[PDB]
Design a protein around this ligand. Sequence first.
Ligand SMILES: CC(C)CCC[C@@H](C)[C@H]1CC[C@H]2[C@@H]3CC=C4C[C@@H](OC(=O)CCC(=O)O)CC[C@]4(C)[C@H]3CC[C@]12C
Ligand SMILES: CC(C)CCC[C@@H](C)[C@H]1CC[C@H]2[C@@H]3CC=C4C[C@@H](OC(=O)CCC(=O)O)CC[C@]4(C)[C@H]3CC[C@]12C
Ligand SMILES: CC(C)CCC[C@@H](C)[C@H]1CC[C@H]2[C@@H]3CC=C4C[C@@H](OC(=O)CCC(=O)O)CC[C@]4(C)[C@H]3CC[C@]12C
Ligand SMILES: *[C@@H]1O[C@H](CO)[C@@H](O)[C@H](O)[C@H]1NC(C)=O
Ligand SMILES: *[C@@H]1O[C@H](CO)[C@@H](O)[C@H](O)[C@H]1NC(C)=O
Ligand SMILES: *[C@@H]1O[C@H](CO)[C@@H](O)[C@H](O)[C@H]1NC(C)=O
Ligand SMILES: *[C@@H]1O[C@H](CO)[C@@H](O)[C@H](O)[C@H]1NC(C)=O
Ligand SMILES: *[C@@H]1O[C@H](CO)[C@@H](O)[C@H](O)[C@H]1NC(C)=O
Ligand SMILES: *[C@@H]1O[C@H](CO)[C@@H](O)[C@H](O)[C@H]1NC(C)=O
Ligand code: NA
Lengths: 426, 426, 426
Amino acid sequence: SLKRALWALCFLGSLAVLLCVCTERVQYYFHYHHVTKLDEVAASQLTFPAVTLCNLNEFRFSQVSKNDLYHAGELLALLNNRYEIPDTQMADEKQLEILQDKANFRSFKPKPFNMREFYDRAGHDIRDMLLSCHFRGEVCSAEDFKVVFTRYGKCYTFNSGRDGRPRLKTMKGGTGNGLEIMLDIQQDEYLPVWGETDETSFEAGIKVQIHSQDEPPFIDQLGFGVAPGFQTFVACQEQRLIYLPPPWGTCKAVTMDSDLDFFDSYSITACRIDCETRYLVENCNCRMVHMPGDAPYCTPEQYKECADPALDFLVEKDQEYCVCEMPCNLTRYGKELSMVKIPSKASAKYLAKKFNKSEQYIGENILVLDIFFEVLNYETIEQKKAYEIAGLLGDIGGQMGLFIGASILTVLELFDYAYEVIKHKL
Amino acid sequence: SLKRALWALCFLGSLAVLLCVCTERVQYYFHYHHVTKLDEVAASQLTFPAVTLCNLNEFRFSQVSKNDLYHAGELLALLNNRYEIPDTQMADEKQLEILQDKANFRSFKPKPFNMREFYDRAGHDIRDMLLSCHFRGEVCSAEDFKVVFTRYGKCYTFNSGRDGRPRLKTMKGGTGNGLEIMLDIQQDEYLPVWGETDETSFEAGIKVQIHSQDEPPFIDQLGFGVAPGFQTFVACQEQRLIYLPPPWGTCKAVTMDSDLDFFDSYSITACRIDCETRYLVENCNCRMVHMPGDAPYCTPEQYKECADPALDFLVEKDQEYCVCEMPCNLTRYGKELSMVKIPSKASAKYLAKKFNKSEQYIGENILVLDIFFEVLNYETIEQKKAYEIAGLLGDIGGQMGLFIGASILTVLELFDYAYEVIKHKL
Amino acid sequence: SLKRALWALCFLGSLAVLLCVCTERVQYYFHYHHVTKLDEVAASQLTFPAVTLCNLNEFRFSQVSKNDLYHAGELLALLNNRYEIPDTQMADEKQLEILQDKANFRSFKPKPFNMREFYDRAGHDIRDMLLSCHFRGEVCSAEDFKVVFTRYGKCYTFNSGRDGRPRLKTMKGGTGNGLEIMLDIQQDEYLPVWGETDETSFEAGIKVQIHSQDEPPFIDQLGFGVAPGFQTFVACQEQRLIYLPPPWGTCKAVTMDSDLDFFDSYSITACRIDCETRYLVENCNCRMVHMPGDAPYCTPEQYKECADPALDFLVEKDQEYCVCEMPCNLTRYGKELSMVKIPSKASAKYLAKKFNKSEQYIGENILVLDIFFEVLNYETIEQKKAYEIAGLLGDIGGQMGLFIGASILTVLELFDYAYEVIKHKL
Ligand SMILES: CC(C)CCC[C@@H](C)[C@H]1CC[C@H]2[C@@H]3CC=C4C[C@@H](OC(=O)CCC(=O)O)CC[C@]4(C)[C@H]3CC[C@]12C
Ligand SMILES: CC(C)CCC[C@@H](C)[C@H]1CC[C@H]2[C@@H]3CC=C4C[C@@H](OC(=O)CCC(=O)O)CC[C@]4(C)[C@H]3CC[C@]12C
Ligand SMILES: CC(C)CCC[C@@H](C)[C@H]1CC[C@H]2[C@@H]3CC=C4C[C@@H](OC(=O)CCC(=O)O)CC[C@]4(C)[C@H]3CC[C@]12C
Ligand SMILES: *[C@@H]1O[C@H](CO)[C@@H](O)[C@H](O)[C@H]1NC(C)=O
Ligand SMILES: *[C@@H]1O[C@H](CO)[C@@H](O)[C@H](O)[C@H]1NC(C)=O
Ligand SMILES: *[C@@H]1O[C@H](CO)[C@@H](O)[C@H](O)[C@H]1NC(C)=O
Ligand SMILES: *[C@@H]1O[C@H](CO)[C@@H](O)[C@H](O)[C@H]1NC(C)=O
Ligand SMILES: *[C@@H]1O[C@H](CO)[C@@H](O)[C@H](O)[C@H]1NC(C)=O
Ligand SMILES: *[C@@H]1O[C@H](CO)[C@@H](O)[C@H](O)[C@H]1NC(C)=O
Ligand code: NA
C-alpha cells in the first residue's frame, strides 16, 4: 500500500523499540541502586569521644600471692601442669627468687578463689599509672576514668558517659585543647617471660581505642598502640554515616530496644559480645570475665576446655550461627598519629625530681598521650536512593508519550473498545 | 451508568494519584540534593606543596639578655611578678648560673623594647638548624626557605611561592625525588623548665605542616610532629575538591579580592587570622606578632590582659561574631607517615666527624625529614547537582503525559473553553 | 485576532522554550557524567595480601671479595675510578682494615663476573634475617618466603601465590591473627659510609609494601618503612575498586593477555616495568637486574652510561613514549601504622639468651612486624553511569509530551502531510 504499508513499520517498530527501552527502566529499578553523598558541615561545639586505654600487661607481678599461682598457674603461663617452674635455665637473677618462695605449696591448704576478684586487685591501677592529665587546661582527677573489663585485663575509659556524669565537649582545635595524659606503664612490674608460648608477647606499651560513646570497648580488634618515651598526637576527625535499610543495603534500623539481651543500645561491637555470651552459657554454662549478664564465671580449670575451644568454633564451623550488621546511624572516628620524643634535655632533671625516679626510668616508662580534634568539622557519608518510585513513573511515561503518544487513559479506551467488539458488533 | 460511571473513578482517580506523584517530584527539587564524584586523573608534572617547619621551642636560652628578662619575664615563665627565679629548689647544676648573673636588675636602667625584634634574634636560625637538604638530588641553600611568623615563634617555609621565586615541580614518585632535609633541633639551647605551668611542655621535636601555597601557615592547629633520631617518610597525595555554591551547599565563590582586609586570596585559615585581627585592634588596639597589618604590636604587660582573655572570647561568647566557609576550589594534601631509625652503626662515626659532635648528640638531635609524592595522581572530589531544573520539566511532564495525556497546550485550551462558557452560552 | 493571535505566542513560545530545554538534556548526555557508590559489604573469609619486605642495605659488607670490588667498585661507591679508597681520613677503626687487604689488586688476574650472581650471594639472607614468624599461631618456615628482585637488591615476598602454593586466608581480625615476623636487620654487616654521594643513605630499617597478589613488587615508590627496636601494628583495609571504560573514564578493560610482553596479568606497576624494559633493550641492548625477559644483563661499566642516563629520559623528554592506565578491577590495601617499643625489661634477659647476643644488640636490631586485618569488611568504590541512553529518551520525550503534546508518530504525520501538500493540492 501507500498510506497503510508505511505504518506496518512505523507504529509496530516504535512499539518494538518501546518494549526494549521500557524494560531497561523497570529492570533498572529492581536492582535498587544507590549513590552516595559526601558533605563537610562545619560546627562550633563538637562532643568528645570516649578514650579507652590499658596496658599491654594483664597482671602485676608484685601482686600475685601463693594462692593465685595455685589455681591460675596454667593461666598465667608461670607454672606447668605439675605445679613447678618449668626448667628456667638462665632465666634471670632476682625474679626467680620471688617465685622460688611463692611456688612452694608445701601443704598450702588453698583458700577459695574468684576470677573477677583476681582482675581487680592484680591489674594495673589508674591511681598509680596516671600522673597528671588535663582537659583544655583544666585539671583532671583519677576519678574521671572508669573501670571496664575486656580481654586485655582491667581497662579504663575516659568520657564514657555512664553512671550519671554527662559528656564533655570541645570548642577549639589545636593540640592543648584535649586530653594530655601522662601515663607510667610500670615496666618494673611486668610478668617474667623467660618461658615461651605461642601467645607470648615481648612488647611494652599501651593500647588505646578512640570510639563513640554508644559502644562497649573492643580493644583487642580495634585499638592502636602508643610507645613509651614518645608523645603521640592523635588527631581526630568525626564522621557521621547514614546507611540504608533493605532491599537497598543492609541495616537493622534504629529503635529503643532492638536485639538487646544484655545491653541497651545496638552496635556492631555490642553484638559479637552478645553472640559470644549466649554461646558460652548454652554450651558448658561458663561466662568469661568480660561478658555481661548474671551467669557465674568459671574456674581457670574450665578456662582451658570452655574458653578457648568453644570460642574457636565461632570462627571455624559456626560462622552462620549469629549474624548482625551495621545500624543506620553510626559515628566513627578517624585518626592520624605522629610522634615527638618526650624526655628532653631540659626536662630530664625536673621529671627525675618530681616523681622521684632515675633518668633511665623516665625515658623508658613515661608516655604522653595527646588527643584532640584537628578542625571542628564533621563529615557525613550518606547513601541516597538512586531511582525512586516517583521517578519511575516519569521515565516510563515519557517514553510511551514519545513513541506512541498513548496515555494510561487511552489503553483503557482500547480495553473498552474491545467491549464494543464483543457484543455490539458480534 | 455504564460508560460514564466508570470514568468517575478513572479520570478522577488517575488525577488523584497524579497530585501525589507530581508533588514528590517538586518537593524533591526544593531540597537541592547533590551527589558526589570521585575520580583519579593521572598526570605527569605535579606541583610541589609548601612545607612549613619549626621547632617546638620559641626562644633560644643562650640568646636572651638582661634586658629581655626584665620586660618579658612573665612571658617566658622564667621570673615571677616580683622579678625573681621562683624558688627553683634542685633545679639544675649549671643552668641556674646563667640566670643567676642575668636576673640581677641591680639599677639596670632598662633600654627600650620591641617584640618582633625579640623574635627575630632569639628564635632558632635556619642557617644553624639546617645542615643539608636536597631536591631531586640537586642541592639546596639556606636561602630557599623563608621566615614566616606564627604562634610557635619564628617558623620557616619551603616552596612558598612568595617574593618572586616560582613554584617547584616534581616529575617522579619515589623517596629521593623530594625534600631530604637534615635538621638539628638544638636540644642544648632549650629553655630550662624546672618550673611548672599549665602551658608547659616536655617534648622536643619539630612541627611540620604540608599545605597548599594559597594559604598562610596555620601550624598550631594543623601540623603533625616529627621525632628526633628518626627519618620520617611523609608520603603525600594531592586532592582537588570542588564544592557547590548555595542553596545546594555552602561556599563563598572565588573572585579576585573576596573578603580581603589584610590578605589577597581567600582561604579558611586565611580567615580566622583576619577575624582575630579585627577583634584585637578594636578591643584594646593591640596586635599580636603573627597578625598582618600596620597596627602597632603591644607590650608583654598588655599580653596578659589583651592577648589571652580577648582571644578566649572568640571561642566562649562571640562564636557568632565572624563566620566564613570553604572556597569552591580547594587543594588539600593527605599524608601517610612511617619512620626509620636514622643514626646507623655505619654512620655513627662519619656524622660525628663531619659536624664535629659526639655520638650521643647525633642520636638525640639529628632528624631527617623526607617528603615526596607517592604516585603522580590527583583525586577530584566534586559535588554535582542531583536534580537540575531541566530534568524537573521532564519528570513532571512524563507523569502528566501518562496519567491524563494532557500537555501544557490543552490546559490552556480548557482555560479558553471557560471563555466559551462565560459569554457565548451565558 | 482573538483566537489565532494568542497562539502566535502560545504554540511558538512553548516551542521556543522546548529547544532550550531539550538541548540541555542532550548536551548533558554527551559529557558522559558519572557518580560513585561507596559500600561496605561484610564477609567472613577474606584472602590475605602479599607482603614484600627487604632491608635498606643492598650488599653485605662481610661478603664481597677482591674480585667484586674490581668490577663493581664504582657501583658500590667504595672505590674511585682509579681503584683506590678515596682519601678516607678518620673513617673508622677496623672497617678500613677489611678493605685495606681487599682493595689491593696487585696482579689480581680477575675472574669473569656476573651481576645477578652478585646479588644472590651478597644480599641479605632470609635464613639469617628472619628469626620466627607465625600465622594465626601456626608456625612459619623460611621456605614460605620467595626471592624476588627489585631496585633495592634482593627482596622477599610472603603469600605471593606463585609456583604452586595457594593463597592463605584469615578468619578473624585482632592482632595475633596475621603475620608476626621477628626480623634482624643486621646492622653489623652494613656497608661503610665514610664517603659522601648524593645517593648516600644514613638510615637502617626495612621497607615493606603490602600489595595485592596480581602485581609485581614496586618497593621503591610504594613502600613504607619500619624502624628497628619497635613493634609496628600495620592494620589493613581491603578495598575493591570498579572503574569505567571510555568515554566515561579511562580504563583498559580486563582480558586474558592484555598488553603482556613479559608478564601475564595487567597492572599499573606491571606496566612501567614493561616500558622500562623495552626502552633499555632497544637503546643500548642492556637489561637491569630487575627487568624480566631473556636479554643479557650488562656490566657495571655499562651501568653508568645506560642504566641511569637512559632511565632519566623517561621522566625528562619521553614522557609521551608509553602510557598505560588503571585496569577496571583493582584491589588496593590501606594501612594505619602504630608502634610499640619491643625490648621490654622482662624480655631483655631472655632474648639475649635465646639468640646469643648482647642487650645492646637486641635494642638496635630486633624488629617485630605485625600485619593483620582490622575488621573483616571490604569497601567497594564503584563508578556508575549518571545518564544512560534509556533515560535520555524518557526526559527528552516527557518535555515534548508536555510543551506541544506531540509524539514521534505525529511528527511523521506532519511529514506525510507535506506529501499531501506537494502533489495533491499542488
Ligand atoms: C498498556 C500500556 C500503556 C502498558 C503500560 C503499563 C504501565 C503503566 C506499567 C508497566 C510497568 C508497571 C510497573 C512495574 C513495576 C512496579 C513495581 C511496583 O513495586 C512496588 O513498590 C510494589 C511492592 C511494594 O509495595 O513494595 C509498583 C508498581 C510499578 C511501578 C508498576 C506501575 C505501572 C507500570 C509502569
Ligand atoms: C493545568 C495542569 C496541567 C498543571 C500543570 C502545571 C505545571 C506546568 C507546573 C506545576 C509545577 C510547576 C513548577 C513548580 C516549581 C518550579 C520552581 C521554579 O524554581 C525557580 O527556579 C524559580 C526561582 C529562581 O529563578 O531561582 C521554576 C518553575 C517550576 C519548575 C514550575 C514550572 C511549571 C510547573 C511544573
Ligand atoms: C520532530 C521533533 C519531535 C524532533 C524530536 C527528535 C528526537 C526524537 C531526537 C532529537 C535528538 C535525538 C538524539 C540525539 C543523539 C543521540 C545520541 C546517539 O548516541 C549513540 O549512542 C549512537 C552512537 C553509538 O551507538 O555509540 C543515540 C540516539 C540519540 C539519543 C538521539 C535519539 C533521538 C533524539 C532524542
Ligand atoms: C540516628 O537516629 C536516631 C533515631 O532515628 C537518633 O536518636 C540518633 O541521634 C541519630 N544519630 C545520628 C548520629 O544522627
Ligand atoms: C625516691 O626513690 C628512692 C629509691 O627508689 C627511695 O629510697 C626514696 O625513699 C624515694 N623518695 C621519695 C620521697 O619517694
Ligand atoms: C578554581 O577556580 C579559579 C577561578 O574560578 C581558578 O583560578 C583556580 O585555578 C581553580 N583552582 C582549581 C584547583 O581548580
Ligand atoms: C669540635 O667540638 C669541640 C667540643 O665542642 C670543640 O672544642 C672543637 O673546637 C670543635 N672543632 C671544630 C673544628 O669545630
Ligand atoms: C574483575 O573482573 C575479572 C573479569 O572481568 C575477574 O576475573 C576478576 O576476578 C574481577 N576482580 C574483582 C576484584 O572483582
Ligand atoms: C655467643 O656469642 C659469643 C660472642 O659473639 C660467641 O663467642 C659464642 O660462641 C656464641 N655462642 C653460641 C652458642 O652461639
Ligand atoms: Na527522568
